[PDB]
Backbone:
DNA sequence: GGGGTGGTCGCTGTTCAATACATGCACAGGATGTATATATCTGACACGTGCCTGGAGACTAGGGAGTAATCCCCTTGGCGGTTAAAACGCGGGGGACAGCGCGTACGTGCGTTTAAGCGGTGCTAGAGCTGTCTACGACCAATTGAGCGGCCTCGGCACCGGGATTCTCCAGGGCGGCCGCGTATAGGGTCCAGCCC
DNA sequence: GGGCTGGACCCTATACGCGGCCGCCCTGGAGAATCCCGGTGCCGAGGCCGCTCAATTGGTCGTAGACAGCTCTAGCACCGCTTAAACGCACGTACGCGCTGTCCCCCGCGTTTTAACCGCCAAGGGGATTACTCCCTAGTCTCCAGGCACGTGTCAGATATATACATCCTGTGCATGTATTGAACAGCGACCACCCC
């Protein structure tokens, strides 16, 4: 077979099924959403890496991720993403 | 024996892959170490943003009487929102087209 | 006497037409030839993926569309409606090119 | 096909310091897009809970919300003197936003300047302004809500100053018309052909374009009275 | 073999369509040649980086990912072809 | 009658003077008060390094000078010589601001 | 303690000097308020990021490096302040 | 036996520090591994660019009859050169000022 | 006791003494040159890092540095910097 | 104060396959900013070596430059019939660029379009174009070089089209004036008050603003004859 | 009983309302383009299946970061003079802006030409993968010399004072094109001689 | 016997050049700004010294990548056919652009005010450093299930056809402003009854 070329397609599809149970998504919109997820991941991760480097921290924690999110995402988008991330981290910590 | 495996996504209540995000952070040359909560936070943020865009795009598709989201609907969702447009201002959406916008002075008297 | 729309009416019709659609506005085959001709200045005997040429075309059309939006803004600033090379030049200069 | 929002206790009494629960039941699945508002008499409502579980800014942790789908609830743990007010659930999961009937509870920097009272004769037209300040004007929709004692709160429509986009409640097509003015950061509401039922308090309310965001800040309310 | 004058393949009707999508109502006759020049410059800039990425990969095929990387390197991120 | 330069002469002289100089053009103390006032909205009781306020002032003056260059180009495009708020808006909106 | 109206500290002659350095010969009277608004927006954008970096460092003093990082993050790279 | 320490900068004939550049590349989270020639190449490139800018700035200082290079001279050197200005187009130089430039239409007559 | 604040001041000064033996440099101009060196170093290193990541290479070699230089430095700057880097690497290898 | 360039072997003879060495002395330290050019008779000179050691593009490794400071050398290893030409060293370390006196050797796409021969009368003025193509016009200076059969090559000056900046040789101030038109990518040299002394071939040469870059591509030359 | 004048009638100048003409605005209708509804179909999307590798579980080791304590630096606050700059007001010129006219360049549409698009076929270059193996980069330990902090001096530059040059503005004078007024010129009016009625 | 026609002398209507006048261009001079030059002083740049820690050296080891070989995919080349789009041309109109005029509003400048700047002093907050500890992350091994490749079917959207509605554009009719003219009315030329001498 071809080598396993992983992507976010299934996760974006799951999120789509949550937010709009009955709508679908074409392959090109699927690729655009993969590109979007990769780009935002790279932006937040790069910003978090720079924050850690600026502070002489070897590790990227959820606090650097939170600060990177506040720096990159605008307006209310930032605080809703922060709320989502904090909720997820709290739930994960509670196991 | 090992307990039944639970994905960290399930532990965090996420659809996005906390495990894969952690592996990409570790392998992406971002830091020496990656805290346990970092991939969870990042997966939550990515899932939130994906959900926001997909919901606006599905709303646009529904308004267009279409059942499947296409790049046009993604473009409409992004550009009709100031925060998403400023997040993705430097981005081209392939096959996305442009917002219909004619300058008023061009319209006939 | 044959029917004719007044000048600018078909232009606005065509604006609404193309601002609604999403397809590529440049002919794909001559754009591909242009891409290959430009690339041969940098390397001889390059292959191009079909998707590589399509990506270049998407990027070029998007760039030109945004540049014409800025050009139209400059023209309206000059109290004109015809866009002109000075308008393109001003848009490029302010945009930083 | 509008989502009727049903608040179970239409009124209740409680002493100081004990817990209170208010239930709001949705006609259809609204997917957690529910908000709770506290309206002390003759004052604009303040948001308490948004996204059906998240406290609004500045709200003490005494207030809490729960539920998803069609069943939602609001809980007030430590009743204090000022908690006496009318509490409204607002759904914004579908295009016509619908407030709850309101639960009257009785016990033992963003600015949206809005014009004062208006007296008008029937058939006239009136223009409520809503001058907004303390935030980036274009980033948030301005939402308009009509409050009457017979019909409670009714959502009129919104203007999105970023692109002048509008949506209106079908009950207010033609009756209402919303326009924006980026230069003065002001939003105007037209009411055409004023009639007897149009005697109401109209609030402009700020709401982010984010889907989970709610009507967060409110104008003081313009009391239109028609003769 | 060689290609010599393919910029004229970006025809005046095509430039008019791009202008119309850009909201342009009326177009000076010199816009077509100015736009051909501008497009030529943009394509040179993007393709030079794309071919640089291709050379680094020791590839002889310019890939869509090479083009995407070139565009991103010039601050013109393109969604739809990555991956 | 007393000497008086014709309008625009002293303007061009000032242009040459401030393009030759490099000093900051905004008064340091009121700019510092402006910075502290703005920062109060984000975090109370902040402190600023003198070099931090100086960096902010360098950046602000450079940004405003570049914006006025673009504004001047827009005004000249409209065949005016007086820069106007419409020119500032045009320059900013073409820059994507 | 509370500062209230310091945007007016960017005086008309100061804006005129900035315009002169920008090569502006004649200045409309409304340029001053428009420029005060523009500078206000730019400063909020930069200072919000600077304060975000300061809060991340759990510092209470905004440093020149915090300002430099904010600017660089905004595409305004400033040389000369420890960058 | 232990040979006399001979710095990699000297081995490459450079002023810029190959050892420091290598340590910065290793500590900067740029890659898992850093080839031996990479810091030499990067130090040579940085030295070239520094030499070019400093020589142009020193020429500008001489033309001004100043002995010491100042930010004004650095700015003049960079802005008066198209390639340096393109490399540093998005860069502000503190105390650098701007180039003398008045649009012709502003001049008298 | 306060820590060592490393900088490129002495190397910039040695380069200056090569190119213009008699002229000096102010502290502010030296700070600007430090900022320039750090900025260009980070640009080239980041581009080389991304090149290695794109090509699934774990290492940054002089060849990635060369490609990053060609990508970043324009025009004749690119050619002359490539020549300088190649000459230095050749001399280092021969020594 | 102009730097004197001194090519010691004013003429040399050699057969095929043997080695030739040409020296070039400097009156002041020029710090390796020296270039070597090969001019076949009635052809524009082609660059061979730049920055005193680096081969120009397309030049085979037979040519070898060396030296620094004031001592410089050009070496040809495997002579060919093609190598029969005149070789000049050019210093550009100091503001008036100076060519060497030349060395005659006997063996027993960037385009700079330049105008054809122009007959002129004394006292008038002549304007010589240099149409540049194949490259980014504004990024490179256009250097102008005068070639008499008697005084050899003389550098007139350059114009840098990016900012229209110019530098002239003191010998040519007023005599020469350089202008550029970005729209046509053309540089014009205007000579004023023509004299029989001015009868020479004028070359426009592209040179990058990079200090180590030399006059790399040359126009075919414009012969000006003054009656 | 004649000379002469105001009264009154007839002819005509002045003005006013109806006639006629030209211009601007709203509308009805034709033509075209677009939205909408219905049927067909195809190919992409969504789901099911096999498997395999990458993520999870469990444990260990160590060092990165958290926390406490101390120092001292550098930030904030205050105060007093001293101007430099800002604010204000005023007079005026010149630039913005509106309006108008012209002519040409661009839009619209039609008929012709061209080459793009699509399908189908064939081929091979090169991308992608696998396997082997070696050189190269990480890692570690000892050593030391390069680079940083601190101190000091001295000269480059900043500032001040004073001429000298340059640039700006404007008031007066030289020079050129258009208009008023006088003259050599010829066209015609008039005098002398020959001729035909 | 005398006026008509021809030729020549004299009265007068006329085309044309010179002086006066108004506009354009030039220049000298006053004044203000800028630049060059010399003198002074001061503070920051450059050099020197001590130290310490990061770079070098030498050696080991494992794995990342270079290289070889092979496969199979997808990119290139070609061909034919349809038809959609480009092209070229004709025509007209509306828009760009130049010109003119108005007027307001920005500039230049002088005067008053104010608060910025600078120098100095003092307090103390918090940034930076150090020491200690512990817990959180990397690393390892095992194992197993989630996600990826592949296959398949069906339904959502693309297409084709017809129709209904919307929009654009223009010829036609209607309303309004204005030139025209026959006539309603009063002023003056001229005929007549009658007064005055």
Residues:
């Amino acid at each position: 077979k071809r080598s396993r070329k992983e992507s976010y397609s299934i996760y974006v599809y799951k999120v789509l099924k949550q937010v709009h149970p009955d709508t679908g998504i074409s392959s090109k919109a699927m690729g655009i959403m993969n590109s979007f997820v990769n780009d935002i991941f790279e932006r937040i991760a790069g910003e978090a890496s720079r924050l850690a480097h600026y502070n002489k921290r070897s590790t990227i924690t959820s606090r650097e991720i939170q600060t990177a999110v506040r720096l990159l995402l605008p307006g209310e988008l930032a605080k809703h993403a922060v709320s989502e991330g904090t909720k997820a981290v709290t739930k994960y910590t509670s196991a | 024996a090992r307990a039944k495996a639970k994905t960290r996504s399930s532990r965090a209540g996420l659809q996005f892959p906390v495990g894969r995000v952690h592996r990409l952070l570790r392998k992406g040359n971002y830091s020496e170490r990656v805290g346990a909560g970092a991939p969870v936070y990042l997966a939550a943020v990515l899932e939130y943003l994906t959900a926001e865009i997909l919901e606006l795009a599905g709303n646009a598709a529904r308004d267009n009487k279409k059942t499947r989201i296409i790049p046009r609907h993604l473009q409409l969702a992004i550009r009709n929102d100031e925060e998403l447009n400023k997040l993705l201002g430097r981005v081209t959406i392939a096959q996305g087209g442009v917002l219909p916008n004619i300058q008023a002075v061009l319209l006939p008297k | 006497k044959p029917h004719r729309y007044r000048p600018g009416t078909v232009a606005l019709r065509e604006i609404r037409r193309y601002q609604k659609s999403t397809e590529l506005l440049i002919r794909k085959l001559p754009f591909q030839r242009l891409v290959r001709e430009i690339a041969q200045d940098f390397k001889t005997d390059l292959r191009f993926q079909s998707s590589a040429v399509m990506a270049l075309q998407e990027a070029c059309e998007a760039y030109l569309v945004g540049l014409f939006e800025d050009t139209n803004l400059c023209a309206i600033h000059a109290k004109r409606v015809t866009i002109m090379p000075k308008d393109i030049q001003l848009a490029r200069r302010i945009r930083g090119e | 096909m509008d989502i009727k929002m049903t608040q179970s206790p239409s009124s209740m009494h409680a002493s100081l310091g004990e817990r209170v629960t208010i239930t709001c039941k949705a006609s259809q699945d609204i997917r957690s897009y529910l908000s709770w508002y506290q309206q002390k008499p003759w004052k604009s409502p303040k948001t308490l809970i948004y996204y059906a579980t998240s406290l609004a800014d500045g709200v003490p942790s005494r207030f809490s919300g729960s539920g998803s789908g069609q069943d939602f609830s609001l809980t007030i743990n430590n009743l204090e003197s000022d908690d006496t007010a009318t509490y409204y659930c607002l759904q914004h999961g579908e295009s016509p936003y619908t407030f709850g009937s309101g639960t009257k509870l009785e016990i033992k920097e963003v600015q949206l300047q809005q014009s004062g009272p208006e007296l008008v004769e029937p058939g006239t037209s009136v223009k409520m302004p809503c001058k907004a300040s303390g935030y980036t004007f274009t980033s948030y929709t301005i939402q308009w809500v009509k409050q009457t004692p017979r019909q409670g709160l009714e959502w009129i429509g919104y203007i999105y100053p970023y692109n002048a986009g509008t949506k209106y409640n079908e009950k207010f097509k033609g009756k209402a018309t919303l326009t924006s003015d980026k230069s003065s950061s002001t939003v105007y509401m037209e009411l055409s052909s004023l009639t007897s039922e149009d005697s109401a308090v109209y609030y402009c309310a700020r709401k982010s374009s984010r889907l989970r965001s709610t009507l967060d800040y409110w104008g003081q309310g313009t009391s239109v009275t028609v003769s | 073999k060689v290609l010599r004058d393919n910029i004229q393949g970006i025809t005046k009707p095509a430039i008019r369509r791009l202008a119309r999508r850009g909201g342009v109502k009326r177009i000076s006759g010199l816009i077509y040649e100015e736009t051909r020049g501008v497009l030529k410059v943009f394509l040179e800039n993007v393709i030079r980086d794309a071919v640089t990425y291709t050379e680094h990969a020791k590839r002889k095929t310019v890939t869509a990912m090479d083009v995407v990387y070139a565009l991103k390197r010039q601050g013109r991120t393109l969604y739809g072809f990555g991956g």
